[PDB]
Amino acid sequence: MASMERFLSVYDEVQAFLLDQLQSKYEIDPNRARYLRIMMDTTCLGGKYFRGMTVVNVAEGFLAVTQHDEATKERILHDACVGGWMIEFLQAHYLVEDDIMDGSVMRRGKPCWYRFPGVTTQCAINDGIILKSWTQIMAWHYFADRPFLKDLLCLFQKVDYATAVGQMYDVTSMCDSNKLDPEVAQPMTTDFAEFTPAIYKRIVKYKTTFYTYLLPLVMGLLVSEAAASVEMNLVERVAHLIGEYFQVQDDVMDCFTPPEQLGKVGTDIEDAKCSWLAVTFLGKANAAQVAEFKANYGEKDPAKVAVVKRLYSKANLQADFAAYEAEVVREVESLIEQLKVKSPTFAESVAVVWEKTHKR
Amino acid sequence: MASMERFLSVYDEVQAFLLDQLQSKYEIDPNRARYLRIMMDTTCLGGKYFRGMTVVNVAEGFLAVTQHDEATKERILHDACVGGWMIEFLQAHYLVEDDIMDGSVMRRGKPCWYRFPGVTTQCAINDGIILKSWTQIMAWHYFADRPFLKDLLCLFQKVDYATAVGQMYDVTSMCDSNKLDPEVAQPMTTDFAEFTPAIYKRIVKYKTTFYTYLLPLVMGLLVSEAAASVEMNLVERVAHLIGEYFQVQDDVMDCFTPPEQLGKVGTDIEDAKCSWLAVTFLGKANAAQVAEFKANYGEKDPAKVAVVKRLYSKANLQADFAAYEAEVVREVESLIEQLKVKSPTFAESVAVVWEKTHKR
Ligand SMILES: [Mg+2]
Ligand SMILES: [Mg+2]
Ligand SMILES: [Mg+2]
Ligand SMILES: [Mg+2]
């Protein structure tokens, strides 16, 4: 079986399990089951499945070098697929709720879930809640007797929480920290003193890297019973590095990739986001450029947004990006090498994760 | 130690643990820690703590009849308090997100969290996410080595999911099921054929009874290592009964308790909710009353809302409520008696849960 066709088949199985259980234990009626099926499909399907497929690919790497009965190989790959779906559904949760939080319009060239006519925010917030509850239902059903159940649940937990903390860091990244206060409407920063590489790295590390790279790698290890084949501090370091790179690419595309190809009209400039572009621009601009940036950033007005893009284009951020990129290559290669000391196999999976991130 | 002062002390401990951990492991800064502290306080404190205190009271009942070292008594009560906080924080999650979903204005005579000036929906949806993630952090930290950890996590999981399913049943209770469709904006029912006792009971069972009565009772059993002292099917039956009664009381108050005393301007009529009042009214109205109800229900217009309240007042729903009440007394008493066969202690805790619900 090709990995993807297996992965997609298990989607059907897991769907059927979840919807069957709603009928037999939760008193659901057919029409509400249908609503939930369409929600699941609309929110969980149609991406590249990169995160979920990482789990599968790590497990396949270990299968190639570890003796097992065929039934065991099948069970490991089935667990890797279920695990990969937990992560895809956790992402689906975050996208549903992030789109509502941000007032986003499109996602993957389609309307955000909450904007569907028969959804609305009222339902969509709860639909996103369900999306995350399904990850736990899947885990308890499919991994009930597995030795890795507690490790897997505890890891998932910690990554989920890191992610929500990262969301807080992201949505508050344009306020001055010393002014955060539930009682007082939050002004945009005027000094941009918190637009630094280190602050940017904290946002991205929590908001993206834990669920996008750490979780799939470690889940692949856990379903393979292979966590003792690796030095976990290196897995953390390499996940944090590659994830930061993925995010930097995303931040560049938000500004410069045509909307039809992006799947989205990017609004980071209007949202005053602490993006890689803003931080890198502020790390090289002269006084005059800084003052032009401050008078134009974080404003809906297209004239001001175009002034911000013009500033980015004249600031030659391609050079800063190539430099960042070369450094990331050095470091990711270094970490891949260190990972070979204990697991050539796993190092190779990480190389593959890196190639697919670096090329996309 | 009085139970409540213990319960509130553990709140402080758990707070400190969560915020300390954010500083030492999640790279949080002090101002964001403060924001989170104020959020926690604002969303978790100031109710009666009925749910969390049920856990404590069930555990205290078993302590009175079970031999234990003093250190063991203390550890059991500490676990009961932590468990009770998990439920309070799970409720806090649901209230934050429900208030945003419903566009609610007040809660406990204070603005809904999302309406605080320095919060906003953008942050509040994520704050509610965090509230639920903290329940898992608490569990993994405080119950790491406990024999009941898996049972407790799996129970919490199932109740959480039941709750979100119940929310879906509640928010969709005024649509015709056969018309649910993500693609089509949902009209209010015109026939009210789905306003039945059985449909009402399904909404309330999932939306409220599992987290409000089942979870606290069973968590008290699990932290006491006492789940084999009870017949679980009876605990389920009695929780479902008492919770339905609690909800019926809530539905009556939404319509008839003055807003200053309610903590809220109730909007169930304008929201076209499948309330106990609507169902009971439709179970006794004549043709003319039914037609007047249909032309006025589910409309913001205060004239139409007052026509609905007038209909309820003339329909003598106090008699239907006294009758419902007497029947609930019979059945809850019957179930308390059946619970004595295996655990007089637990039966008594359930009697106390019932008295505090029946009197409030
Ligand atoms: Mg966002
Ligand atoms: Mg982006
Ligand atoms: Mg609601
Ligand atoms: Mg109510």
XYZ file of C-alpha atoms and ligand atoms in Angstrom:
724
model
C 0.000 0.000 0.000
C 1.271 3.554 -0.867
C 1.359 5.605 2.325
C -1.080 8.209 1.257
C -3.778 5.764 0.120
C -3.422 4.089 3.489
C -3.670 7.444 5.277
C -6.801 8.422 3.374
C -8.418 5.094 3.935
C -7.965 5.394 7.634
C -9.664 8.843 7.375
C -12.746 6.981 6.205
C -12.514 4.464 8.952
C -12.061 7.064 11.627
C -14.953 9.135 10.206
C -17.220 6.122 10.240
C -16.191 5.194 13.723
C -16.861 8.763 15.053
C -20.258 9.105 13.297
C -21.356 5.579 14.202
C -20.508 6.193 17.804
C -22.522 9.442 17.745
C -25.539 7.433 16.595
C -25.158 4.513 18.994
C -24.099 6.353 22.087
C -24.866 10.082 21.707
C -28.417 9.858 20.440
C -27.595 11.770 17.282
C -30.042 12.010 14.463
C -29.082 11.538 10.847
C -29.272 15.118 9.807
C -26.913 16.289 12.552
C -24.601 13.385 11.658
C -24.555 14.670 8.173
C -23.792 18.189 9.293
C -20.802 16.758 11.285
C -19.590 14.679 8.393
C -19.597 17.661 6.094
C -17.862 19.769 8.773
C -15.162 17.129 9.260
C -14.580 16.871 5.563
C -14.535 20.578 4.997
C -12.199 21.344 7.808
C -9.886 18.296 7.784
C -9.449 17.512 4.113
C -7.916 19.225 1.157
C -4.523 20.248 2.439
C -1.248 18.351 1.751
C -1.509 16.322 4.999
C 2.130 17.098 5.636
C 1.852 16.805 9.416
C -0.104 13.547 9.527
C 2.028 11.999 6.761
C 5.207 12.828 8.772
C 3.960 10.389 11.447
C 3.457 7.691 8.759
C 6.881 8.382 7.166
C 8.776 8.182 10.520
C 7.008 4.878 11.279
C 7.786 3.476 7.760
C 11.474 4.379 8.295
C 11.601 2.216 11.446
C 9.655 -0.590 9.832
C 12.388 -0.942 7.260
C 14.998 -1.804 9.891
C 13.063 -3.510 12.685
C 11.905 -7.147 12.683
C 8.148 -7.575 13.061
C 5.334 -9.962 12.069
C 3.305 -8.650 9.165
C 0.249 -8.121 11.464
C 2.567 -5.929 13.620
C 3.700 -3.895 10.638
C 0.077 -3.310 9.754
C -0.874 -2.360 13.270
C 2.064 0.110 13.500
C 1.124 1.763 10.188
C -2.552 1.900 11.254
C -1.530 3.550 14.521
C 0.711 6.000 12.630
C -2.275 6.912 10.421
C -4.587 7.373 13.385
C -1.918 9.465 15.121
C -1.410 11.564 11.947
C -5.186 12.183 11.868
C -5.154 13.324 15.435
C -2.680 15.996 14.400
C -4.636 16.952 11.261
C -7.820 17.274 13.319
C -5.897 19.345 15.936
C -4.790 21.638 13.119
C -8.422 21.755 11.820
C -9.466 22.919 15.297
C -6.886 25.700 15.294
C -7.755 26.843 11.759
C -11.467 26.969 12.432
C -11.007 28.998 15.637
C -8.099 31.201 14.232
C -10.179 32.091 11.182
C -13.035 33.202 13.414
C -10.649 35.055 15.793
C -8.942 36.861 12.894
C -12.063 37.562 10.854
C -10.488 35.723 7.983
C -12.292 35.369 4.674
C -10.716 32.465 2.807
C -8.607 29.438 3.487
C -7.382 27.076 0.689
C -9.283 29.167 -1.944
C -12.580 28.350 -0.118
C -14.603 30.381 2.458
C -13.625 29.922 6.063
C -15.863 27.400 7.773
C -17.639 29.987 9.923
C -18.652 31.866 6.772
C -20.592 29.019 5.303
C -24.233 30.095 5.225
C -25.636 27.281 7.414
C -22.736 27.403 9.869
C -22.210 30.839 11.408
C -19.926 31.764 14.202
C -22.394 30.456 16.743
C -21.981 26.972 15.450
C -18.409 27.177 14.108
C -16.766 27.921 17.538
C -18.436 24.737 18.861
C -17.556 22.802 15.685
C -13.947 23.649 16.331
C -14.321 22.430 19.915
C -15.645 19.118 18.552
C -12.732 18.826 16.136
C -10.315 18.792 19.079
C -12.552 16.485 21.209
C -12.456 13.963 18.287
C -8.674 13.756 18.619
C -9.163 12.431 22.165
C -11.968 10.079 21.173
C -9.692 8.623 18.454
C -6.827 8.194 20.877
C -8.876 6.432 23.596
C -10.582 4.127 21.088
C -7.681 3.125 18.890
C -4.875 3.213 21.470
C -6.714 1.905 24.535
C -4.403 -1.006 25.106
C -1.198 0.481 23.690
C 1.902 0.915 25.861
C 2.448 4.394 24.400
C -1.065 5.695 25.253
C -0.035 7.753 28.238
C 3.094 9.183 26.613
C 1.115 10.005 23.459
C -1.788 11.689 25.425
C 0.631 13.658 27.608
C 2.710 14.824 24.556
C -0.459 15.799 22.643
C -1.635 17.736 25.644
C 1.563 19.692 26.076
C 1.765 20.516 22.358
C -1.879 21.669 22.313
C -1.267 23.941 25.244
C 1.992 25.270 23.757
C 0.000 26.045 20.593
C -2.691 28.064 22.409
C 0.066 29.963 24.291
C 1.626 30.659 20.913
C -1.664 31.953 19.620
C -1.758 34.397 22.550
C 1.820 35.485 21.736
C 0.784 35.971 18.043
C -2.488 37.967 18.612
C -0.780 40.226 21.157
C 2.472 40.717 19.202
C 1.518 44.282 18.109
C 0.733 45.580 21.591
C 3.276 46.848 24.057
C 3.609 44.228 26.756
C 3.630 46.756 29.540
C 0.187 47.967 28.363
C -1.601 44.543 28.314
C -4.637 44.827 30.467
C -8.059 43.235 30.214
C -9.640 46.453 31.336
C -8.082 48.737 28.677
C -8.572 48.487 24.882
C -5.178 47.639 23.468
C -3.414 50.249 21.261
C -1.009 49.205 18.538
C 2.649 49.756 19.517
C 4.127 52.998 18.206
C 7.788 52.110 18.952
C 7.908 48.558 17.626
C 10.526 47.770 20.283
C 9.097 44.340 20.628
C 9.648 43.528 16.949
C 12.891 41.641 17.526
C 14.317 38.328 16.248
C 14.059 36.805 19.717
C 10.435 37.846 20.226
C 9.560 36.674 16.760
C 11.221 33.343 17.459
C 9.120 32.941 20.649
C 5.857 33.539 18.769
C 6.690 31.126 15.997
C 8.147 28.427 18.267
C 4.909 28.165 20.296
C 2.319 28.941 17.623
C 3.567 26.613 14.912
C 6.620 24.505 15.568
C 5.334 22.307 18.366
C 2.233 21.031 16.442
C 3.711 21.156 12.950
C 7.111 19.477 13.418
C 7.674 18.333 17.007
C 4.404 16.482 17.458
C 4.512 14.550 14.138
C 8.142 13.494 14.745
C 7.622 12.354 18.284
C 4.287 10.682 17.542
C 6.086 8.666 14.847
C 8.650 7.654 17.475
C 6.000 6.712 20.013
C 3.836 4.549 17.702
C 7.087 2.746 16.681
C 8.169 2.264 20.301
C 11.407 3.977 19.238
C 11.676 7.028 21.536
C 14.826 5.491 23.120
C 16.526 5.455 19.681
C 16.834 9.240 19.811
C 18.168 12.044 21.864
C 14.984 13.984 22.564
C 16.810 17.311 23.074
C 18.036 17.058 19.457
C 14.628 16.262 18.156
C 13.352 19.356 19.904
C 16.155 21.510 18.547
C 15.700 20.369 14.993
C 11.915 20.657 15.080
C 12.207 24.222 16.416
C 14.611 25.121 13.657
C 12.758 23.676 10.796
C 9.442 25.034 12.032
C 10.845 28.527 12.328
C 11.989 28.282 8.707
C 8.522 27.070 7.581
C 6.980 30.139 9.307
C 9.452 32.570 7.817
C 8.450 31.204 4.364
C 4.772 31.605 5.289
C 5.354 35.230 6.437
C 7.102 36.044 3.105
C 4.289 34.517 1.069
C 1.624 36.479 3.021
C 3.090 39.676 1.601
C 4.369 38.636 -1.909
C 2.555 35.450 -3.240
C -0.467 36.380 -5.473
C -3.734 35.798 -3.574
C -5.098 33.143 -6.094
C -1.895 31.086 -5.559
C -1.750 31.860 -1.821
C -5.350 30.513 -1.233
C -5.853 33.773 0.789
C -5.608 37.651 0.535
C -2.770 37.997 3.113
C -3.409 40.677 5.721
C -0.267 40.596 7.986
C 0.606 44.198 7.264
C -2.900 45.463 8.015
C -3.026 43.229 11.084
C 0.302 44.748 12.296
C 1.696 41.240 12.699
C 5.182 40.677 14.081
C 6.246 38.984 10.813
C 9.708 37.992 9.700
C 9.512 40.823 7.097
C 8.767 43.481 9.696
C 11.438 42.390 12.091
C 14.070 41.959 9.348
C 13.100 45.317 7.792
C 13.478 46.981 11.240
C 16.854 45.252 11.695
C 18.233 47.082 8.587
C 16.221 50.257 7.983
C 17.594 53.789 8.450
C 15.809 56.447 10.551
C 13.757 57.716 7.652
C 12.601 54.202 6.588
C 11.672 53.377 10.183
C 9.540 56.538 10.384
C 7.816 55.732 7.088
C 7.122 52.167 8.314
C 5.552 53.494 11.563
C 3.291 55.946 9.803
C 1.960 53.181 7.467
C 1.996 49.782 9.241
C -1.068 48.182 10.825
C -3.619 50.132 8.717
C -6.376 48.728 6.504
C -5.949 51.590 3.963
C -4.441 50.054 0.720
C -2.304 53.120 0.060
C -0.486 52.553 3.402
C -0.227 48.787 2.795
C 1.354 49.464 -0.596
C 3.826 51.900 1.103
C 4.780 49.058 3.488
C 5.331 46.574 0.546
C 7.334 49.175 -1.362
C 9.548 49.600 1.749
C 10.033 45.838 1.972
C 10.895 45.581 -1.775
C 13.453 48.422 -1.640
C 15.059 47.001 1.535
C 16.356 43.927 -0.331
C 14.988 41.364 2.107
C 15.929 38.622 -0.402
C 19.514 39.003 0.795
C 18.518 38.754 4.452
C 16.359 35.695 3.498
C 19.146 33.907 1.566
C 21.474 34.513 4.514
C 18.874 33.190 7.005
C 18.308 30.235 4.702
C 22.010 29.364 4.445
C 22.352 29.481 8.174
C 19.262 27.232 8.647
C 20.852 24.739 6.178
C 24.042 24.633 8.260
C 22.302 24.130 11.478
C 19.698 21.567 10.247
C 22.491 19.569 8.624
C 24.503 19.732 11.859
C 21.500 18.469 13.820
C 20.819 15.671 11.277
C 24.393 14.541 11.775
C 24.114 14.561 15.525
C 20.838 12.456 15.163
C 22.889 9.726 13.264
C 24.908 8.937 16.412
C 21.816 7.162 17.845
C 19.504 6.616 14.769
C 20.494 6.852 11.199
C 16.903 5.909 10.273
C 15.323 8.751 12.244
C 18.019 11.169 10.948
C 16.934 10.241 7.483
C 13.298 10.877 8.189
C 14.253 14.282 9.501
C 16.282 14.890 6.314
C 13.169 14.083 4.354
C 11.063 16.476 6.508
C 13.692 19.126 5.897
C 13.827 18.555 2.071
C 10.040 18.828 1.823
C 10.024 22.034 3.817
C 13.053 23.603 2.052
C 11.774 22.859 -1.494
C 7.974 23.660 -1.271
C -10.297 22.657 57.603
C -13.789 23.675 56.275
C -14.192 22.273 52.772
C -14.603 25.535 51.023
C -11.515 27.178 52.545
C -9.575 24.126 51.445
C -11.061 24.341 47.944
C -10.192 28.016 47.612
C -6.711 27.510 48.892
C -6.040 24.897 46.304
C -7.256 27.447 43.683
C -4.304 29.578 44.723
C -1.920 26.710 44.562
C -3.099 25.604 41.170
C -2.962 29.204 39.868
C 0.582 29.588 41.096
C 1.607 26.288 39.643
C 0.120 27.158 36.181
C 1.638 30.683 36.081
C 5.007 29.536 37.419
C 5.171 26.839 34.818
C 4.366 29.394 32.090
C 7.376 31.415 33.235
C 9.816 28.529 33.623
C 8.862 26.472 30.635
C 6.791 28.585 28.209
C 8.944 31.686 28.095
C 6.116 33.905 29.269
C 6.720 37.459 30.267
C 5.230 39.019 33.360
C 2.657 41.127 31.669
C 1.155 38.193 29.770
C 1.227 36.191 33.020
C -0.765 38.910 34.582
C -3.258 38.950 31.753
C -3.703 35.145 32.276
C -4.067 35.479 36.005
C -6.770 38.074 35.627
C -8.491 35.937 32.962
C -8.418 32.869 35.216
C -9.818 34.810 38.104
C -12.484 36.499 36.080
C -13.681 33.390 34.394
C -13.238 30.765 37.142
C -14.183 32.594 40.311
C -17.298 34.136 41.704
C -19.869 31.420 41.234
C -21.052 29.011 43.990
C -18.497 26.320 43.009
C -21.276 23.774 43.221
C -19.690 21.377 40.733
C -16.170 21.415 42.168
C -17.470 21.251 45.757
C -19.536 18.129 44.847
C -16.223 16.316 44.213
C -14.950 17.429 47.662
C -18.237 16.454 49.391
C -18.322 12.930 47.826
C -14.692 12.403 48.906
C -15.411 13.682 52.484
C -18.339 11.216 52.699
C -15.991 8.282 51.996
C -13.325 9.608 54.321
C -15.764 9.353 57.184
C -16.125 5.587 56.775
C -12.794 4.420 55.361
C -9.600 3.866 57.375
C -6.648 5.952 56.200
C -3.474 7.598 57.548
C -3.891 11.320 58.035
C -1.438 12.032 55.141
C -3.776 9.882 52.964
C -6.841 11.824 54.037
C -5.053 15.015 53.107
C -3.919 13.689 49.773
C -7.474 12.490 48.932
C -8.985 15.883 49.822
C -6.245 17.670 47.832
C -6.992 15.453 44.837
C -10.736 16.098 45.241
C -10.019 19.855 45.209
C -7.813 19.614 42.140
C -10.456 17.469 40.429
C -13.201 19.974 41.393
C -11.076 22.753 39.840
C -10.719 20.812 36.657
C -14.496 20.822 36.404
C -14.802 24.520 37.308
C -12.201 25.400 34.674
C -14.045 23.166 32.135
C -17.210 25.110 32.917
C -15.239 28.409 32.576
C -14.196 27.248 29.097
C -17.789 26.552 28.099
C -19.081 29.858 29.498
C -16.434 31.923 27.773
C -17.070 30.257 24.394
C -20.949 30.052 24.840
C -21.098 33.751 25.686
C -19.188 34.585 22.520
C -21.277 32.121 20.435
C -24.553 33.545 21.783
C -23.550 37.203 21.730
C -24.313 37.371 25.403
C -23.908 40.604 27.330
C -23.646 39.726 31.013
C -22.854 36.782 33.199
C -23.011 36.944 37.053
C -23.944 40.688 36.885
C -20.586 41.380 35.120
C -19.741 41.772 31.380
C -18.953 38.597 29.520
C -15.221 38.042 29.287
C -15.046 38.752 25.554
C -16.606 42.170 26.162
C -13.872 43.382 28.415
C -12.141 46.236 26.606
C -8.629 44.709 26.502
C -9.895 41.225 25.661
C -12.038 41.118 22.524
C -13.312 38.112 20.729
C -9.963 37.608 19.059
C -8.346 36.914 22.358
C -11.331 35.500 24.280
C -11.847 32.436 21.964
C -8.184 31.518 22.610
C -8.509 32.312 26.335
C -11.312 29.806 26.485
C -9.111 27.263 24.707
C -6.452 27.828 27.389
C -9.002 27.374 30.164
C -9.683 23.833 28.937
C -5.960 23.082 28.276
C -5.283 24.015 31.961
C -7.605 21.216 33.072
C -5.267 18.736 31.353
C -2.123 20.389 32.681
C -3.567 20.131 36.222
C -4.454 16.490 35.753
C -1.032 15.427 34.391
C 0.854 17.361 37.077
C -1.149 16.514 40.163
C -2.289 12.998 39.229
C 0.799 11.733 37.400
C 1.342 8.770 39.649
C -2.267 8.114 40.666
C -3.966 4.796 39.880
C -7.106 6.657 38.777
C -5.314 8.899 36.222
C -6.426 7.010 33.156
C -10.013 6.521 34.329
C -10.218 10.197 35.324
C -8.740 11.445 31.950
C -10.990 9.129 29.933
C -14.143 10.174 31.924
C -13.249 13.881 31.588
C -12.781 13.400 27.889
C -16.107 11.709 27.329
C -17.973 14.309 29.403
C -16.281 17.173 27.520
C -17.268 15.675 24.218
C -20.832 14.972 25.403
C -21.002 18.646 26.432
C -19.937 19.974 23.009
C -22.466 17.605 21.352
C -25.059 19.037 23.708
C -24.097 22.534 22.701
C -24.720 21.567 19.061
C -28.125 20.125 20.046
C -28.920 23.406 21.930
C -27.844 25.927 19.192
C -29.688 23.951 16.511
C -32.841 23.254 18.565
C -34.904 25.899 16.676
C -34.123 24.611 13.189
C -35.903 21.773 11.477
C -33.535 18.832 11.448
C -34.338 17.915 7.892
C -33.180 21.407 6.809
C -29.715 21.378 8.516
C -27.159 22.083 5.889
C -23.865 23.937 6.017
C -24.568 25.421 2.637
C -27.984 26.960 3.460
C -28.693 29.678 6.069
C -30.882 28.048 8.674
C -34.510 29.273 9.040
C -36.315 29.083 12.355
C -38.849 26.219 12.487
C -42.417 27.277 11.732
C -44.073 24.040 12.967
C -42.224 23.537 16.241
C -42.631 19.776 15.768
C -39.280 19.250 17.322
C -40.286 20.998 20.552
C -41.051 17.785 22.423
C -40.230 16.472 25.923
C -37.943 13.818 24.459
C -36.012 16.264 22.275
C -35.746 18.687 25.141
C -34.443 15.917 27.371
C -31.736 15.075 24.779
C -30.518 18.685 24.639
C -30.366 19.070 28.384
C -28.844 15.637 29.058
C -25.829 16.359 26.808
C -25.437 20.108 27.309
C -25.603 20.208 31.089
C -26.069 16.989 32.991
C -22.850 15.210 32.102
C -20.514 18.061 33.271
C -22.710 19.414 36.053
C -23.754 16.244 37.913
C -22.236 13.104 36.380
C -18.649 14.303 36.243
C -18.498 15.702 39.818
C -20.068 12.516 41.249
C -17.833 10.128 39.403
C -14.700 12.216 39.947
C -15.442 12.055 43.686
C -15.674 8.268 43.363
C -12.446 8.019 41.396
C -10.280 10.179 43.709
C -11.615 8.038 46.624
C -10.878 4.775 44.802
C -14.546 3.949 45.439
C -16.019 3.376 41.951
C -16.633 -0.307 42.873
C -18.856 0.805 45.796
C -21.531 1.893 43.326
C -23.641 0.684 40.507
C -22.544 3.041 37.744
C -25.825 2.707 35.797
C -27.639 4.172 38.832
C -25.214 6.992 39.161
C -25.842 7.818 35.531
C -29.602 7.633 35.943
C -29.669 9.846 38.982
C -27.264 12.402 37.529
C -29.400 12.630 34.372
C -32.504 13.171 36.440
C -31.199 15.746 38.757
C -29.457 17.628 35.966
C -32.629 17.775 33.923
C -34.394 19.298 36.929
C -31.598 21.893 37.392
C -32.037 22.899 33.709
C -35.798 23.122 33.925
C -35.312 25.550 36.868
C -32.789 27.527 34.801
C -35.221 27.708 31.825
C -38.005 29.028 34.133
C -35.734 31.669 35.634
C -34.606 32.870 32.163
C -38.170 33.992 31.509
C -39.464 35.064 35.004
C -36.546 35.979 37.425
C -35.824 39.781 37.386
C -32.619 40.491 35.426
C -30.737 42.079 38.458
C -31.375 38.858 40.457
C -30.798 36.596 37.433
C -27.277 38.107 36.767
C -28.452 38.301 33.087
C -31.269 39.715 30.800
C -32.602 36.273 29.708
C -33.115 35.964 25.962
C -34.472 32.369 25.462
C -37.679 33.574 23.876
C -35.901 35.865 21.418
C -33.360 33.126 20.736
C -36.237 30.680 19.970
C -34.729 28.217 22.433
C -36.281 24.798 22.964
C -36.921 25.617 26.651
C -38.965 23.691 29.165
C -41.536 26.555 29.034
C -41.965 26.314 25.274
C -42.292 22.579 25.197
C -44.663 22.475 28.197
C -46.725 25.358 26.756
C -46.987 23.454 23.423
C -47.987 20.291 25.317
C -51.122 22.078 26.688
C -52.054 24.961 24.383
C -55.177 25.030 22.187
C -55.058 25.804 18.439
C -55.430 29.523 18.942
C -52.657 29.707 21.605
C -50.336 27.669 19.385
C -50.921 30.100 16.500
C -50.267 33.108 18.738
C -47.043 31.467 20.011
C -45.825 30.862 16.415
C -46.476 34.406 15.297
C -44.484 35.811 18.285
C -41.692 33.389 19.306
C -38.051 33.800 18.293
C -38.283 37.579 17.650
C -36.188 40.345 19.210
C -39.182 42.767 19.214
C -40.219 43.332 22.923
C -43.909 43.464 22.048
C -43.703 39.865 20.706
C -41.577 38.721 23.670
C -44.176 40.140 26.055
C -46.926 38.276 24.081
C -44.931 35.048 24.611
C -44.595 35.706 28.430
C -48.283 36.575 28.671
C -49.076 33.225 26.964
C -46.842 31.389 29.429
C -48.448 33.179 32.441
C -52.022 32.429 31.301
C -51.160 28.769 30.566
C -50.596 28.013 34.271
C -47.195 26.391 33.842
C -46.814 26.414 37.657
C -49.117 23.393 37.728
C -47.113 21.568 35.067
C -43.926 22.511 37.037
C -45.246 21.278 40.419
C -46.289 18.026 38.741
C -42.856 17.637 37.073
C -41.247 18.445 40.406
C -43.262 15.843 42.331
C -42.385 13.218 39.807
C -38.650 14.137 39.972
C -38.862 13.794 43.803
C -40.292 10.279 43.459
C -37.756 9.142 41.029
C -34.683 10.741 42.723
C -35.770 9.226 46.032
C -36.213 5.835 44.348
C -32.715 6.080 42.875
C -31.210 7.179 46.234
C -32.725 4.074 47.769
C -31.357 1.811 45.097
C -27.856 3.453 45.681
C -28.042 2.344 49.423
C -27.887 -1.342 48.424
C -24.159 -0.877 47.620
C -23.207 2.471 49.350
C -25.171 4.238 51.959
C -22.406 6.881 52.069
C -22.590 7.671 48.354
C -26.433 7.613 48.517
C -26.184 10.263 51.154
C -23.915 12.440 49.097
C -26.401 12.187 46.272
C -29.194 13.151 48.704
C -27.172 16.202 49.587
C -26.644 17.058 45.873
C -30.377 16.681 45.393
C -31.307 18.888 48.433
C -28.999 21.659 47.220
C -30.478 21.530 43.748
C -34.133 21.249 44.894
C -33.901 24.148 47.406
C -31.784 26.811 45.519
Mg -4.368 34.059 13.702
Mg 0.731 33.653 7.692
Mg -25.541 28.966 24.519
Mg -30.642 29.375 30.527
